[PDB]
């Protein structure tokens, strides 16, 4: 179905001419287009699959962005600007300001190399500021990950790095925006305990204990570690394995959370029911280690990032650092000069 209406040269809604595909996902496609009714201005158009769950999510995203873009019309808090929406051969299409690559895509195109620490500090500060603005207006995003953080401009300079015997790209401007508001949920709406595909998922979500704003803080911690290492610390698609990986990196889960969960399959007595000496178990031991052993330097700026990450990755959501507190953390002192 979609392949028939998203090709270079096709014209959407009698005005948007498709140039090329920027990226794909489970939801559909994002394409760059020329807007022939706004003087040729280039824009990004998200074309949503004609499938009920994604159509519903798209309708929800439209409502959320209307509210956020009117509350913050100059994008002071760095939520992407929605320009319009329309329907095209049974597909919902949402038009946005054109941004650069996602942070994930940049990492991938640079050979899975990490961002350097001064860029991480700026990006982290903007992400915390943006999502805190959501938290101040009774929203939780629920789906934060590097694919959903995008550079305003993704241009780079390029040089041979003698230390690693490989060519390396350096972002010119690290400014970002947050996208994808199709899972975003208000305090006063129903919170599905069930949630779909992701490894930025908080332990209270996996154990079905209820969730709200703190689950976003957990996700942001996972993102910051990825930016620092160039790869995910939870490379898994199985819930039980994921919990085993958490235990190895952060220590054992709090007893009171193990006691409250109705997900009894994961536990024997009050311990994670995980065979350490299986095929999968030996892989977890070999790929994961305590958090601080991932540090690449002992320099104080690195220690500061790791202290903030540790507090974001607190198991109990009632004890987890909030984003208001995280914006005052010493890791960010260097930005207030
Ligand atoms: C798969 C997707 C991230 O691929 C790219 C890859 C490169 C650029 C863009 C991109 C450029 O300007 C944009 C404005 C909005 C969005 C958007 C809105 N919702 N979602 C899920 C993305 N995406 C862009 C997207």
Curated annotation (Swiss-Prot):
Tissue specificity comment: Endothelial cells.
PTM characteristics: Autophosphorylates on all three types of residues.
Domain Protein kinase, chain residue ranges per copy: 16-332
UniProt similarity note: Belongs to the protein kinase superfamily. CMGC Ser/Thr protein kinase family. Lammer subfamily.
Keywords: ATP-binding, Kinase, Nucleotide-binding, Nucleus, Phosphoprotein, Serine/threonine-protein kinase, Transferase, Tyrosine-protein kinase
Subcellular location, record wording: Nucleus
Binding site for ATP: 22-30, 46
Keyword Transferase recorded: yes
Keyword Kinase: yes
Molecular function per GO: ATP binding; non-membrane spanning protein tyrosine kinase activity; protein serine kinase activity; protein serine/threonine kinase activity; protein serine/threonine/tyrosine kinase activity; protein tyrosine kinase activity
Parent sequence residues shown: 148 to 482 of 484
Biological role stated in the UniProt entry: Dual specificity kinase acting on both serine/threonine and tyrosine-containing substrates. Phosphorylates serine- and arginine-rich (SR) proteins of the spliceosomal complex and may be a constituent of a network of regulatory mechanisms that enable SR proteins to control RNA splicing. Phosphorylates: SRSF1, SRSF3 and PTPN1. Regulates the alternative splicing of tissue factor (F3) pre-mRNA in endothelial cells.
Residue numbers annotated as active site: 143 (proton acceptor)
EC category: transferase
Protein name: Dual specificity protein kinase CLK1
EC number of this enzyme: 2.7.12.1
Oligomer status and interactors: Interacts with PPIG and UBL5.
Reaction(s) this enzyme catalyzes, per UniProt: L-seryl-[protein] + ATP = O-phospho-L-seryl-[protein] + ADP + H(+); L-threonyl-[protein] + ATP = O-phospho-L-threonyl-[protein] + ADP + H(+); L-tyrosyl-[protein] + ATP = O-phospho-L-tyrosyl-[protein] + ADP + H(+)
One Gene Ontology CC term in the entry: nucleus
């Amino acid at each position: 179905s979609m392949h028939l209406i998203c090709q270079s040269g096709d014209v959407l809604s009698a005005r948007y001419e498709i140039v090329d595909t920027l990226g794909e996902g489970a939801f559909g496609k994002v394409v760059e287009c020329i807007d022939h009714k706004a003087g040729g201005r280039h824009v990004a158009v998200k074309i949503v699959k004609n499938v009920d769950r994604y159509c519903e999510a798209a309708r929800s995203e439209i409502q959320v962005l209307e509210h956020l873009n009117t509350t913050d019309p100059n994008s002071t808090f760095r939520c992407v600007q929605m320009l319009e929406w329309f329907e095209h051969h049974g597909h919902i299409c949402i038009v946005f300001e054109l941004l650069g690559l996602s942070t994930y895509d940049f990492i991938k195109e640079n050979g899975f190399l990490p961002f350097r620490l001064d860029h991480i500090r700026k990006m982290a500060y903007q992400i915390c500021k943006s999502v805190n603005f959501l938290h101040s207006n009774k929203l939780t995003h629920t789906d934060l990950k590097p694919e959903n953080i995008l550079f305003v401009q993704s241009d780079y300079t390029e040089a041979y790095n003698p230390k690693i015997k490989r060519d390396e790209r350096t972002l010119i401007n690290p400014d970002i925006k947050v996208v994808d508001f199709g899972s975003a949920t208000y305090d006063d709406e129903h919170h599905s305990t069930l949630v779909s595909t992701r490894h930025y998922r908080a332990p209270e979500v996996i154990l079905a204990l209820g969730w709200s704003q703190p689950c976003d803080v957990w996700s942001i911690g996972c993102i910051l570690i990825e930016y620092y290492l160039g790869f995910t610390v939870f490379p898994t698609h199985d819930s039980k394995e994921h919990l085993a990986m958490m235990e190895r990196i952060l220590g054992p889960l709090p007893k009171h959370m193990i006691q409250k969960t109705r997900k009894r399959k994961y536990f024997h007595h009050d311990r994670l029911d995980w065979d350490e000496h299986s095929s999968a178990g030996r892989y977890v031991s070999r790929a994961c280690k305590p958090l601080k052993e991932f540090m690449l330097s002992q320099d104080v700026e690195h220690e500061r990032l790791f202290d903030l990450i540790q507090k974001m990755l607190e198991y109990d959501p009632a004890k987890r650092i909030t984003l208001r507190e995280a914006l005052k953390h010493p890791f960010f002192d260097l930005l207030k000069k």
